[PDB]
Design a protein around this ligand. Structure first.
Ligand SMILES: Cc1cnccc1CN1C[C@@H](c2cc(F)c(F)c(F)c2)CC1=O
Length: 430
């Protein structure tokens, strides 16, 4: 059977243990994750300055789907390189645009290019880990997304603290697209994931890559489209086979509900705080939007740190359930606070409580699936997560003049479903 390879692969990985290659690559892929976070922030609160920016999320959905499909048929480095090239190129041309009609098209294309940055990055770094510290390392890697969000927020506040409606978004977009260019430049000098080569049958190339990794670690101590179009459906439609069906549906449900809840709440908080400030002003009778939720992303890092060292001591399923429950209880408790500083503190707490669940999610998604679908399934789940994000943003933007209890209960129900499904997932023996 085409299954008795992971044993020898992990025996080799544990024999080499951990060294400096898994730190160099850690940072190289963290750069791409940082660029993805920068893009997500730019599309979230900076772009709508007319909340039609969800077309960018749709573009990122299509991108994540396509890149997840193509990653295992083109490798985890060629696909990542192409995705980051498309992103950087289009997000750099977005600064020489002439208005909105073409600017939003360029941003949509950049989103399509950068959608396949979380799935490929996480799978690629998962195929270089010893599996006894896999969860902790992946959780640490996740922090670069928050670093990217913080970087984008700081640059946006320092450069463009105003509303679009001589040139501001041009220089701002250059600064925001710098990280993707740096990620490409740093990633040009990495080897394609060895497990991909082993699955392709080119065991010689996989052995060469593994030997190069060992050398790096030892320093211390036309018709082609048809073939590549029907073959990606092999990875996807097989992800609904008898073996991986219940796992995949539960995974889809967890991703959908929890991403929807998080994105809805993160768009809600700045709006509700702004409305409260407006009410305070009436009581007398965007320079702060990049401070709000920027402090949230800064206060999330403690949660990620607490969810990284304990990611393996407790388990990759307990952690998930016990973080989803806490996230749901925090969403319920959000209504308790009715101020500005209190609301900011509650937002920071909720972010720090949900980041642990997110990290457990990303560890479990890459652990469950085999080498063949480790990226196709992850890309599909990320596309569904972005669909849920679009739905959450659209729903939560509507709730302005409606009582906060409605969004509170909506997010609480979504997180309750997420927690139930996560607790209902299979064990870690997969
Ligand atoms: C790393 C990652 C892995 N897989 C899929 C997506 C991602 C990227 N993130 C981060 C998540 C997040 C949730 C929070 F509640 C926070 F407070 C926070 F700061 C960040 C939301 C998301 O989509």
């Amino acid at each position: 059977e085409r299954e008795e390879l992971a044993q020898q692969y992990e025996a080799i990985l544990r024999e080499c243990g951990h060294g400096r290659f898994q730190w160099t690559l850690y940072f190289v892929l963290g750069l791409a994750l940082m660029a993805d976070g920068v893009e997500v922030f730019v599309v979230g609160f900076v772009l709508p300055s007319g909340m039609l920016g969800l077309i960018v999320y749709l573009g990122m959905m299509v991108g994540a789907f396509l890149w997840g499909g193509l990653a295992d048929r083109l490798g985890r480095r060629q696909c990542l390189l192409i995705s980051l090239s498309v992103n950087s190129v289009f997000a750099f041309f977005s600064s020489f645009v002439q208005g909105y009609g073409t600017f939003l098209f360029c941003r949509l294309l950049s989103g399509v290019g950068i959608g396949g940055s979380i799935p490929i990055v996480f799978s690629y770094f998962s195929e270089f880990l010893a599996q006894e510290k896999r969860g902790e390392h992946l959780s640490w890697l996740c922090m670069f997304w928050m670093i990217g969000g913080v970087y984008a927020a700081a640059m946006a506040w320092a450069i463009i603290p105003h509303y679009g409606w001589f040139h501001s978004w041009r220089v701002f977009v250059l600064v925001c697209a710098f990280p993707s260019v740096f990620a490409i430049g740093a990633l040009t000098t990495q080897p394609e994931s060895p497990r991909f080569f082993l699955e392709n049958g080119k065991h010689d190339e996989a052995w060469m890559v593994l030997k190069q990794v060992h050398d790096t670690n030892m320093r211390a101590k036309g018709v082609r489209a048809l073939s590549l179009g029907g073959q990606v459906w092999g990875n996807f439609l097989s992800c609904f086979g008898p073996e991986y069906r219940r796992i995949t549906l539960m995974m889809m449900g967890v991703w959908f509900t929890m991403s929807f809840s998080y994105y809805g709440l993160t768009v809600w908080f700045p709006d509700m705080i702004r409305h409260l400030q407006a009410v305070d002003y009436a009581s007398r009778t965007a320079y702060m939007v990049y401070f709000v939720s920027f402090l949230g992303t800064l206060a999330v890092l403690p949660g990620n740190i607490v969810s990284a060292l304990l990611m393996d001591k407790i388990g990759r399923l307990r952690m998930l359930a016990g973080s989803s429950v806490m996230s749901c209880v925090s969403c319920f408790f959000l209504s308790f606070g009715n101020s500005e500083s209190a609301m900011i503190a509650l937002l920071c707490l909720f972010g720090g409580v949900s980041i642990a669940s997110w990290n457990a999610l990303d560890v479990l998604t890459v652990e469950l699936y085999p080498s063949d679908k480790r990226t196709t399934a992850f890309g599909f789940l990320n596309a569904l997560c972005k669909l849920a994000a679009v739905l959450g943003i659209s729903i939560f933007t509507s709730f302005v003049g409606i009582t906060k209890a409605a969004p509170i209960l909506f997010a609480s129900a979504a997180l309750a479903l997420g927690s139930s499904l996560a607790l209902k997932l299979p064990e870690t023996r997969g």
